[PDB]
Amino acid sequence: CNPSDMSHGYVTVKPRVRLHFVELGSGPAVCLCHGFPESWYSWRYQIPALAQAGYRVLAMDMKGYGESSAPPEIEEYCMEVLCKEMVTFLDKLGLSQAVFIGHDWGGMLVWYMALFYPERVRAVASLNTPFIPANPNMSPLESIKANPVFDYQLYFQEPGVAEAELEQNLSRTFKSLFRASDESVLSMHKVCEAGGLFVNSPEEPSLSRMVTEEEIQFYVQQFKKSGFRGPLNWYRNMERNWKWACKSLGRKILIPALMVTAEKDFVLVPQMSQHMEDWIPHLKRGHIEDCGHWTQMDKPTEVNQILIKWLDSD
Amino acid sequence: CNPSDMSHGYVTVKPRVRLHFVELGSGPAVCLCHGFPESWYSWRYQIPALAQAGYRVLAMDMKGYGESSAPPEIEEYCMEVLCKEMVTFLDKLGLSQAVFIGHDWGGMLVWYMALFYPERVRAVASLNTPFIPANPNMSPLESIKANPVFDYQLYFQEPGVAEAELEQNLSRTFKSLFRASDESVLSMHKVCEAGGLFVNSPEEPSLSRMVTEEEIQFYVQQFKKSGFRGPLNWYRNMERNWKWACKSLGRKILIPALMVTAEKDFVLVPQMSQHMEDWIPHLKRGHIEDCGHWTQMDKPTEVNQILIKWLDSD
Ligand SMILES: N#Cc1ccc(C(=O)N[C@H]2C[C@@H]2c2ccccc2)cc1
Ligand SMILES: N#Cc1ccc(C(=O)N[C@H]2C[C@@H]2c2ccccc2)cc1
């Protein structure tokens, strides 16, 4: 995928903040929302496929990333603020609605969009990220003690720490992260007592089967502008996000919905989604075998097929 | 229009040539192409109305203007090059077809788009500018010599001359130009003899009833970036344009088409369009009474009515 061959759009959603996106195709608007720590470019395989399938694709740089604004303040990346900005995005583009498709943190965003702004969301799809109604009893910090696979999230809390490690060597960062599950050089059991995320992983990791050197270098260039502060801030609003989700928990998602699970995502595990039909009875599903966290990159053909089928039906 | 309330798009059509556009709405793509010496902003009254009517509007800064590239070479602004660029624009955006609507020089462009690239043009509409097939006998230079109302065109030929006069005082330039026909302060009949287009006209023109100070100052700010060289270059390719037009070999335009005439446009007079049905069988027509050259600004309600009716039927 060549960026200069793409149409680049820019929408100021408030004085300090503009969102960049890439746009391809004609037809119903489909807004793609990437996760951490990614880019509009993580959708490179879906963009032309969806456009060819008859859709107008808007692939975002989410707030904090690429050519979009990345203010430093933690509170600029709470879900409530992020969602209101996506609604302003649609307004300024003159879109009454769009289909929203998200992955990872972008998947959490699209569920909140469907929940609090159903009038603006035609249909909702998430890759890897389940939708669980807020639990009125437990805080999100309490859920890390119950579920220890999210211990790296505690490491991500302290401003400056994860940033310094992830920005030290961008090429090594992206090569370490973007790998098939069987190629993985990272463990999520205890990270901050271990000293850091990369402490015991190769200084010059090999290039994963999933990615070329050229694709890795694109991410490198992108993260040179703002680095990891904005992206990491997405993790630093757990209590605010929890309190906002609580303001909804009575109401239901009534729009068409798709939950796509990845067999080998060891952080956002397929089973984390098991009882979603209890609160979304009309929920459709996709499941991808031999697929790690980096779904769109790991199994693009399978992602394309699942999304196009669902888009063309419900 | 508030420009910062708009989505701004950018497409690289050649390594060093970028086209800027404003985008609003969902539905079939409608590409608006302004004239001399104007802006995407000349479509300000049409953009929201067309979007509200169910269309996805892409209002261009044409090559040489605003935030689009403005290379200095005369040859970069021949109709053949400008048209091929607009096809590349469509390619990069992933648009198989768009409706093209032009005014003035943008009107000439959309006629050539419909003529040489009908497969990319869903339907074509021109404000003021007729389509008359190239005459293989008479040169464009000989035709300017016949009708004395195009003397300003000769004055526009030598590079540097008209630029220095139009750039001298941008505010006076736009206030002198953008006026209703009954308000006009300019000698279009004879310009080159006098030594100036504004030589006789008021040093401090009043504000036409058509425009506010705020609107005039927008054009002033746009023309600060690249000035008048690019815009004037559109006029400096008469022989090349004629040679390209002859390559059509008397082929017809077979797609849906609309010709809108303006009663009080004294440069692009309604009679200049009178025999157009002979080379465009199906041609539909609109006509606006009490309308001077600056059609979109002069009679925006009538323009909107005419265009929406035509779009919805054809
Ligand atoms: N709701 C929700 C939600 C969304 C996203 C994540 C998340 O953390 N994603 C993982 C892949 C990224 C990661 C982890 C560790 C190092 C580098 C990247 C956790 C919870
Ligand atoms: N085909 C064709 C074609 C297109 C455009 C024109 C043209 O000249 N437009 C006029 C309005 C602009 C103008 C003229 C003089 C001073 C300032 C602006 C003439 C022929």
Side-chain angles (χ1 to χ4, degrees), chain B residues 190-219:
Chain B
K190 55 282 302 285
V191 181
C192 219
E193 306 158 0
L197 173 64
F198 302 133
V199 58
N200 283 7
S201 60
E203 269 289 324
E204 273 182 286
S206 61
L207 200 56
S208 164
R209 69 179 181 267
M210 289 197 320
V211 282
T212 66
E213 187 69 39
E214 290 77 5
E215 291 170 323
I216 289 292
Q217 286 317 306
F218 180 92
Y219 287 92

Side-chain angles (χ1 to χ4, degrees), chain A:
Chain A
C1 177
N2 192 349
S4 64
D5 290 345
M6 310 313 285
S7 181
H8 293 263
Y10 303 82
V11 172
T12 302
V13 294
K14 57 183 77 139
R16 294 266 190 327
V17 181
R18 81 166 176 192
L19 300 175
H20 162 254
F21 65 103
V22 163
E23 183 170 42
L24 187 73
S26 56
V30 177
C31 180
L32 305 181
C33 300
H34 68 79
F36 176 94
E38 297 181 63
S39 165
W40 72 259
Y41 187 74
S42 295
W43 297 107
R44 60 198 176 275
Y45 294 112
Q46 289 70 48
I47 293 159
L50 299 186
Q52 176 67 31
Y55 299 89
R56 169 183 179 189
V57 175
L58 303 208
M60 308 299 301
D61 273 330
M62 304 300 286
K63 185 183 192 173
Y65 293 89
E67 301 187 54
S68 297
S69 305
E73 300 77 16
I74 291 165
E75 303 93 334
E76 284 285 306
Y77 302 85
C78 67
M79 270 299 163
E80 191 178 5
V81 167
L82 293 168
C83 284
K84 292 191 221 292
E85 284 171 359
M86 287 306 292
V87 178
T88 304
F89 182 74
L90 300 178
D91 283 354
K92 291 209 180 176
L93 274 154
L95 301 176
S96 53
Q97 291 193 314
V99 174
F100 278 78
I101 304 178
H103 163 259
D104 187 76
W105 273 112
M108 191 57 52
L109 178 298
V110 303
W111 290 125
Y112 278 113
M113 289 293 297
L115 229 211
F116 282 93
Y117 298 96
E119 77 277 0
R120 310 307 292 273
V121 184
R122 183 64 177 85
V124 63
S126 168
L127 310 190
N128 304 49
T129 317
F131 168 69
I132 324 283
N135 192 298
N137 293 292
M138 38 130 273
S139 64
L141 186 66
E142 196 191 310
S143 299
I144 299 168
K145 283 145 193 165
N147 209 166
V149 71
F150 312 106
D151 194 274
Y152 66 92
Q153 276 174 239
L154 249 168
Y155 174 74
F156 286 173
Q157 294 309 293
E158 188 87 276
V161 186
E163 286 98 326
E165 196 195 1
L166 290 158
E167 296 186 19
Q168 201 273 316
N169 186 336
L170 291 171
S171 184
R172 177 172 183 241
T173 292
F174 289 112
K175 288 189 185 187
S176 302
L177 294 177
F178 301 159
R179 313 183 72 80
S181 57
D182 49 291
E183 297 170 314
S184 172
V185 292
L186 300 176
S187 300
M188 276 70 196
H189 273 244
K190 187 61 87 276
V191 181
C192 32
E193 275 187 31
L197 197 67
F198 301 133
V199 163
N200 17 253
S201 42
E203 304 294 335
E204 267 148 67
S206 81
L207 201 71
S208 155
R209 91 173 65 107
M210 298 195 317
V211 287
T212 65
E213 179 67 39
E214 293 63 38
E215 301 174 320
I216 286 290
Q217 290 307 312
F218 178 89
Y219 287 95
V220 170
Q221 176 198 252
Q222 288 301 293
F223 281 76
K224 279 187 170 161
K225 175 203 171 197
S226 302
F228 280 79
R229 186 182 174 103
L232 278 162
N233 282 347
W234 280 69
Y235 291 94
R236 299 175 175 160
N237 292 281
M238 298 304 177
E239 184 173 53
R240 282 175 292 258
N241 293 349
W242 174 47
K243 287 180 162 189
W244 189 52
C246 279
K247 290 186 179 174
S248 72
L249 88 321
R251 67 194 88 169
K252 298 165 73 75
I253 307 304
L254 312 175
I255 61 174
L258 207 213
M259 177 68 224
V260 186
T261 47
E263 184 180 27
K264 304 302 195 87
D265 191 341
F266 300 144
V267 60
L268 299 168
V269 167
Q271 79 108 42
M272 281 169 47
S273 77
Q274 58 192 331
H275 297 113
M276 280 179 56
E277 25 277 292
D278 296 3
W279 43 87
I280 313 160
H282 56 292
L283 178 82
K284 304 291 182 287
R285 281 188 184 267
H287 184 73
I288 313 177
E289 309 299 330
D290 188 36
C291 190
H293 177 70
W294 315 101
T295 319
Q296 308 103 301
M297 255 190 260
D298 203 332
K299 295 278 174 296
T301 297
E302 290 83 349
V303 173
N304 295 171
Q305 196 282 323
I306 290 167
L307 295 180
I308 296 165
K309 181 188 183 194
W310 173 76
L311 284 171
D312 284 353
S313 47
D314 72 289

Side-chain angles (χ1 to χ4, degrees), chain B residues 36-38 103-106 108 129-130 150 152-153 156 166 177 186 188 197-198 235 238 265 267-268 272 293-294:
Chain B
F36 176 94
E38 296 186 61
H103 166 253
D104 188 75
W105 274 108
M108 194 58 60
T129 314
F150 295 114
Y152 70 97
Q153 282 193 205
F156 285 178
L166 302 163
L177 292 176
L186 302 186
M188 290 292 175
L197 173 64
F198 302 133
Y235 287 96
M238 295 303 173
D265 188 338
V267 29
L268 307 169
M272 288 168 51
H293 176 75
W294 316 99

